[PDB]
Amino acid sequence: MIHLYDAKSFAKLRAAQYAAFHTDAPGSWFDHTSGVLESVEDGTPVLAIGVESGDAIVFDKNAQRIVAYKEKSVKAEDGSVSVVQVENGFMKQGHRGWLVDLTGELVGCSPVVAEFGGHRYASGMVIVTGKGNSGKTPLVHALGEALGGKDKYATVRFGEPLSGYNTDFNVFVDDIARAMLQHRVIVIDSLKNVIISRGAFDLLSDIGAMAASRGCVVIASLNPTSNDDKIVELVKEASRSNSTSLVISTDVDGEWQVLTRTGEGLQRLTHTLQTSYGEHSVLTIHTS
Amino acid sequence: MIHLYDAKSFAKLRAAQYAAFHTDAPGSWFDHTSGVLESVEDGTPVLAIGVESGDAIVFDKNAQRIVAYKEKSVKAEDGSVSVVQVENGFMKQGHRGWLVDLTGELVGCSPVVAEFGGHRYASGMVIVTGKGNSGKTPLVHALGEALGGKDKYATVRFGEPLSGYNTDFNVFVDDIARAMLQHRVIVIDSLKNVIISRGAFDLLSDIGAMAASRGCVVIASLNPTSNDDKIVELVKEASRSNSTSLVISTDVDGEWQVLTRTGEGLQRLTHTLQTSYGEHSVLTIHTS
Amino acid sequence: MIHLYDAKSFAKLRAAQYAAFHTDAPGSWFDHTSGVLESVEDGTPVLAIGVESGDAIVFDKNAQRIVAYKEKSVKAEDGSVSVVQVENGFMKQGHRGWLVDLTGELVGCSPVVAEFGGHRYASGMVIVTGKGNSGKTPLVHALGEALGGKDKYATVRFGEPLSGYNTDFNVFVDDIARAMLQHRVIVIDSLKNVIISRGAFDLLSDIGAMAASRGCVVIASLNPTSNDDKIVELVKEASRSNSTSLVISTDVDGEWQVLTRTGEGLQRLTHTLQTSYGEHSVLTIHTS
Amino acid sequence: MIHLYDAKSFAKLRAAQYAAFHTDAPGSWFDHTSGVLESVEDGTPVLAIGVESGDAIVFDKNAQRIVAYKEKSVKAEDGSVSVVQVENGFMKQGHRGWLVDLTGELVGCSPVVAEFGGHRYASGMVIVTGKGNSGKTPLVHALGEALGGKDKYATVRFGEPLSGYNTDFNVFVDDIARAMLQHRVIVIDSLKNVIISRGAFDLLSDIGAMAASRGCVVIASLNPTSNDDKIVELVKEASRSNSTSLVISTDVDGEWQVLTRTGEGLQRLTHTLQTSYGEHSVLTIHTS
Amino acid sequence: MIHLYDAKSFAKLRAAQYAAFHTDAPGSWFDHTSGVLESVEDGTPVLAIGVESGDAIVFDKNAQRIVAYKEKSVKAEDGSVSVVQVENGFMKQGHRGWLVDLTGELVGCSPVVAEFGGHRYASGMVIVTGKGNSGKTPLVHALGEALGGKDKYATVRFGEPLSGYNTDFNVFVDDIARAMLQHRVIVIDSLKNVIISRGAFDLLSDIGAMAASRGCVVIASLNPTSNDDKIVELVKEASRSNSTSLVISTDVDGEWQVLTRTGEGLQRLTHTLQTSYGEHSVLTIHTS
Amino acid sequence: MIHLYDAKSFAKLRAAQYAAFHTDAPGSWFDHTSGVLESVEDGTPVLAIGVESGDAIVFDKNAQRIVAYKEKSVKAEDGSVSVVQVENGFMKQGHRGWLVDLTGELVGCSPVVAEFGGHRYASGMVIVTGKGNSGKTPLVHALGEALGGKDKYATVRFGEPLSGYNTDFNVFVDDIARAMLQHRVIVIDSLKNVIISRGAFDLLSDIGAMAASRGCVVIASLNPTSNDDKIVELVKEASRSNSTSLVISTDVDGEWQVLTRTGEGLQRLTHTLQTSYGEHSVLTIHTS
Numbered sequence A, B, C, D, E, F: 001m002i003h004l005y006d007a008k009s010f011a012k013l014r015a016a017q018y019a020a021f022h023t024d025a026p027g028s029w030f031d032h033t034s035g036v037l038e039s040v041e042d043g044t045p046v047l048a049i050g051v052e053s054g055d056a057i058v059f060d061k062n063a064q065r066i067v068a069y070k071e072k073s074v075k076a077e078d079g080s081v082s083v084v085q086v087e088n089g090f091m092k093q094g095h096r097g098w099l100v101d102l103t104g105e106l107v108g109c110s111p112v113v114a115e116f117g118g119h120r121y122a123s124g125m126v127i128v129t130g131k132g133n134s135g136k137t138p139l140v141h142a143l144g145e146a147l148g149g150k151d152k153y154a155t156v157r158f159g160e161p162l163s164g165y166n167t168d169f170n171v172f173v174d175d176i177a178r179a180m181l182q183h184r185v186i187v188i189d190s191l192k193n194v195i196i197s198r199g200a201f202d203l204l205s206d207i208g209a210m211a212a213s214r215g216c217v218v219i220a221s222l223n224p225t226s227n228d229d230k231i232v233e234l235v236k237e238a239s240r241s242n243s244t245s246l247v248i249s250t251d252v253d254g255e256w257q258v259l260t261r262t263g264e265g266l267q268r269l270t271h272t273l274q275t276s277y278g279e280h281s282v283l284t285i286h287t288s
């Protein structure tokens, strides 16, 4: 919905957004939205996501697809009306994204998802990309483990000529919905096949916000299949745009740069990462 | 409708347009159209706006969508006939834009929306853009506050990987209609995802005029996701074209230029803005 | 229809075409076609024009849209057959353009629409364009007044972020049909939003001839939203092509060049225009 | 249909093709096909031509459109089967082009259409083009008169902002069919609006052969609306390709070059033309 | 179908393919498939070829189109199933290409179609192209005669502004099917209008193989209508790709180069051709 | 489905993936999935693959197309639900790829398909490409024989102007499904005609993973029909992307480089190949 502000309420909002990243307990936001989701009435649509065609499928709090749901409406504080209707396994009415309010008046944040190596990481979309054929896969997985911390991280595999990899876009989105609905730390191996169909385009556009709202982090690998020219710069551009945080390779081997958007209109941060390989290509991110 | 003129009536028109920006009390035009809107018969369509598909949805004076409305016509002074019909929540007949006359014979104006720091600002579409990754978001919000003055400004959020941001174009237009129907000062955070679908294209084309007619100002952020080359110049071009006023960054940090179209065939004005950051990235525009 | 010629009839045609611009009383052609139109049977389709989709709407001599009209045919001298049929507010049968013969055997002319400042001006399409952000709007209006002479000129407003401006293409064409059917001098403020949909493309293609045939002049503003490069030259090219006359800005401030096509295969003329601003940006074209 | 050859029959064919241009009486071929057409059964489809959409309309020997024609077939010498069927004013079955055999075994010719100034001219498509804004219209008309000789030439007007010009593609093709069915010399003023829709594309592809087969000549003006760069060379290229003969302007004023294809695999000829203007821009081609 | 191989069967295959070009009696393959075709049950579909739309028409051994054919299936050695069904004159089921097995286990060959001037020529698609406006038409016909030898060669005419030339793609494919079904040597004058519609694209893709399988040769003219730049090189590229043999012009007048693919994975051969003109542009290829 | 990991389970996965290529008995994975497939219930869909249109056809364990299959669902460990439904010979419900789990928890592998010349080769997609018109066909076949070892390799022929070659994309995919379902080593001669339709695009995207999952290797020829410029580098790029292993030609004649992806996030290997020709172009890869 839309929000109204004057100098005073605006200053309160910014402080709140600033706190959501800098002072809130890492992962607290995720815990909060988890509570919101489980309090939702059984059978209630909570998430709509677009499929390849452009239509969208709907899920409930248990990551189960909703096939039929008689039209229902809701009136917001803003005075706007939200309406949802699922028919024949497709959203007849409604919009893509979260179908229940997780944020409330607190919007425009990059909820702290985790803390590691002396740095706070934001939830939302995190694109790992840069100089082709580098160690992007090893890096997303190490990051997945580090940010998961005490928790296991979820892995969504898509579009790679390796065993067991799904290459059907509709299964892919189904995997993403389940992931964001049930896990704080998520890895998507190769966004290569997405970058275009309507559903695919919808994904670039919706994922970051969906994740940021849930308070989860989606760490996606994006190796520029394109040339080895300054075309990567265009990819890196289209990435800072659709991402909450960016992670790109550098001149120095094993080194990556992390560019984080800490929130709406807030300062963008940058810190470095040093990594090394161990047995069976398991990558480790040096902390201290 | 069309209007006829001879040297004398034309000179009267120009003086009137000139007055609408230079001498009218700031915000008076908004107040006037507000009165026109509330005098409208209950259930009467007042605004039609295109959705992604290209079809358009219709609203009444209370920003409530009209779903069914039996065909009805009206005969203008021009002799032309206006017809509106809504069926199944879509305009069966009519046109995009205001469905009731707010301007009358006084057209081609840039109604003064507010006065601040010794400068008058025009209503209509205001695009804030320029050298990528600058302080565009902080700037639209400060401007929102400044022009709102005694009033709160409305904020429409769209297409950013931040928490609570809607990424569905149809919700977006719904948010814009409600805003222009109820608030004089409006901020749209990121027009990035719009720039293309038919509805999106319709938006660039219709917004400025819809706002100018209402007498409200829509301050939209437009960070060129494109290259960091002279591609921004093309964006800045496509912006002077669809905007009533333009605000672009300069060589000097914190400094912006405001290019205003004061009205049909009237002189274009330019003045400078100096800004600075405070706590939690709240931007302040220096007045005196 | 098609016309046959031998050296002698051809010479008579050229003399007639030459006369239609050089010796006929300015505006006499308009008066003539007005008479032809009013003699048309009531309810008879006289003008068909394409809408955005590509379909076309039909009007009668009073600029009223025809919604239903049972198929009817006519046999020309050429032996060809003209057929018109309107159903559900759309041309089921027929062609775009004038649906009744206004020209007869006298075709390929640039009927003199007016005389001013010692120069004769042709009817048809007149595009005013050149070096971006110049005084194109002030210029079309001054021209509108000058060529209107004793008569008021009609103003069609479209696609500008100013108050009261229509931004819906279908209303636009409706405004153009009414204008050409009832006024000898017409101004279209901004063809910017047209230059593409089928209806829009149809417009560039049909307007000049429709106007030339009616004997009216359509003075359209065309500010190249494009770059500030030699892209304007391409616009200026696409303009000499679809126009009867061209008006472009020069190196010298306030000066414009008028390139006129005086008729089929006839000589193209060029003369200069000196202008200056007065109060409220009202432009004046210096005569003597 | 397809034809079989051995060295001997091939040599006979080439001699025949050579004769069709070099020794046959100018215009004899046209006379011959005229006889073939008038011997055709009444109501029999003889010519099919594509309209803008891609569908095609059918005509009889009197240039009257056929609206309904029950399926009918014919077996050729080749063993192939020709089938025609018209329903609802459109070819349900059949192909574009001549629907009755005018050529027989004698194909691949450029029938001499006329002789003038000591040169033989071929029937078929003749494109007049070159350096923009030159005297193309005056040139096609003089050529029309010269090649018409004792006969009047037919003039098809299309896509120019002049009075009486049709701008509807479907009327255009209707005009072309009637012309080729009834006149040996034809002028098409401006192919500018054709160069793209399916019908338009069909035209470039079919006209030359239709004309060559009939034994008539279609002299079309093609002023490159495009740049004033070496883009004209690309137009001149696309012209030698779809034309039987080419006529292009030179460095010298009033001078044109005529490049003629004398027949299948035969030598291409070139000769020069000197022209001058008289009263009312009537152009004259110097003979002796 | 698919074929299985080990080192030994593979070596047998290669020897067989090598034999099909180097030692088999020229034209023997054509004779063989002719026998296979005539042994086919009456009314049995034998060839399917795509029309402009993308659908395909079906023919029987006598080059007669099949309009209705009740679904029928066949089980191959490979275990795969072939199914054909024609309804309303279109392939409801089946695939493009030969509908009966002509090759068997012997695939990947370039059957020798003829011997002339001390060189063996392969069946399949032969594209004659190179430096624009050269003697391509004279060359395909001389080649047609030479390879036809004791037999007449068939000529398919398409897309040229000459008398009697078909310009309808559907008639064209109909002509090609009849040709390949009844003649060993075939000439297609101008593939210019094909190079794009689906049917046209299908043609480039299917012809070479259809011809190679039949054991006939299709000699097609392809004059690059494109620029006179290194764009011909791109055409020459797209030609080596879709052709069995390539024939291109050289620096020396009258000289051409013949690049032949002798078979699957086999060596590509090249030899030169010297030609000269006689009366009526009949070209002769010098043998001894 | 999605998989969850912590540092420990992740390390176990990587070791397992590493083992699938480095220590498992060559071809053991293929044998394993063969067992899984034959244990599948009769009539059960096991593989779905896209056809040109974009729809997909379904096969059972015997490579027989399924035409009708009443909707059926399955619940995975992940909690996700797999659903399949075939109607009118097309997948009404389901996804492209394997319809039964062959991998299980062991995903992201490059199963060793064979060992030869002291090197292990991975299953999945193998693209052979590089400097145009080289010995790509001889190379894929030698590789087919070498990797087949004790077994015969399967050969799928497509899009080449040679005898017996299928040029219909739908037959092609039918050939690929049968191959991957029944043979460990597969050769596809020319992917040239695929590189675009939806089905074709689906193929590039799905094949590698389908093969890797089955444990079979698809060796495809890809001669860049494109220029002879650095366009091949772009092809070589689009190839490393969709391939499990890459084989490209070098400066040295007969020499090729083999770039292998050994598994998810694992090290990429490179080794060289020396080859020579024998009789009838049979290529031999030098081992010792």
Ligand SMILES: Nc1ncnc2c1ncn2[C@@H]1O[C@H](COP(=O)(O)OP(=O)(O)O)[C@@H](O)[C@H]1O
Binding pocket: A132, A133, A134, A135, A136, A137, A138, A223, A277, A278, A280, A281, F261, F264, F265, F266, F267, F268
């Ligand atoms: N032990 C290692 N030492 C150095 N580099 C390694 C090691 N293990 C893996 N890599 C690199 O990690 C990458 C493998 O993961 P992959 O997903 O295929 O690559 P990418 O991130 O470029 O998409 C490769 O570029 C590979 O060369």
Ligand SMILES: Nc1ncnc2c1ncn2[C@@H]1O[C@H](COP(=O)(O)OP(=O)(O)O)[C@@H](O)[C@H]1O
Binding pocket: A261, A264, A265, A266, A267, A268, B132, B133, B134, B135, B136, B137, B138, B223, B277, B278, B280, B281
């Ligand atoms: N306190 C500050 N001092 C200097 N720059 C700031 C400060 N706070 C925010 N910014 C800048 O404001 C911008 C943040 O808002 P954001 O919307 O993400 O950027 P943009 O306007 O480029 O779209 C960033 O470019 C950030 O670097």
Ligand SMILES: Nc1ncnc2c1ncn2[C@@H]1O[C@H](COP(=O)(O)OP(=O)(O)O)[C@@H](O)[C@H]1O
Binding pocket: B261, B264, B265, B266, B267, B268, C132, C133, C134, C135, C136, C137, C138, C223, C277, C278, C280, C281
């Ligand atoms: N009094 C004036 N003196 C000089 N220039 C003026 C004056 N009044 C208006 N203009 C110019 O006229 C133009 C305003 O009309 P507008 O329609 O917005 O421009 P354009 O013709 O470039 O589309 C502007 O370029 C403005 O700078």
Ligand SMILES: Nc1ncnc2c1ncn2[C@@H]1O[C@H](COP(=O)(O)OP(=O)(O)O)[C@@H](O)[C@H]1O
Binding pocket: C261, C264, C265, C266, C267, C268, D132, D133, D134, D135, D136, D137, D138, D223, D277, D278, D280, D281
């Ligand atoms: N008497 C004349 N002397 C010199 N040029 C002339 C004369 N009459 C006409 N022209 C030229 O003939 C052309 C007019 O015909 P038009 O159809 O508009 O041009 P185009 O052939 O370039 O399409 C113009 O280029 C004009 O300048």
Ligand SMILES: Nc1ncnc2c1ncn2[C@@H]1O[C@H](COP(=O)(O)OP(=O)(O)O)[C@@H](O)[C@H]1O
Binding pocket: D261, D264, D265, D266, D267, D268, E132, E133, E134, E135, E136, E137, E138, E223, E277, E278, E280, E281
């Ligand atoms: N007797 C001849 N001497 C030299 N060239 C000739 C002779 N006869 C024909 N030609 C050339 O043969 C070609 C004619 O056949 P055509 O099909 O029109 O050409 P193309 O092969 O370029 O498509 C022309 O380029 C023409 O100049």
Ligand SMILES: Nc1ncnc2c1ncn2[C@@H]1O[C@H](COP(=O)(O)OP(=O)(O)O)[C@@H](O)[C@H]1O
Binding pocket: E261, E264, E265, E266, E267, E268, F132, F133, F134, F135, F136, F137, F138, F223, F277, F278, F280, F281
């Ligand atoms: N005996 C041989 N010696 C050298 N080169 C050969 C030999 N046999 C075949 N070749 C080469 O192998 C290739 C033939 O297979 P083909 O599929 O047509 O080529 P490509 O791999 O370029 O697609 C050709 O480039 C040919 O010149």
Ligand SMILES: [Mg+2]
Binding pocket: A136, A137, A189, A190, A221, A222, A223
């Ligand atoms: Mg990766």
Ligand SMILES: [Mg+2]
Binding pocket: B136, B137, B189, B190, B221, B222, B223
């Ligand atoms: Mg912003």
Ligand SMILES: [Mg+2]
Binding pocket: C136, C137, C189, C190, C221, C222, C223
């Ligand atoms: Mg203007």
Ligand SMILES: [Mg+2]
Binding pocket: D136, D137, D189, D190, D221, D222, D223
């Ligand atoms: Mg002309």
Ligand SMILES: [Mg+2]
Binding pocket: E136, E137, E189, E190, E221, E222, E223
């Ligand atoms: Mg040719």
Ligand SMILES: [Mg+2]
Binding pocket: F136, F137, F189, F190, F221, F222, F223
């Ligand atoms: Mg090959």
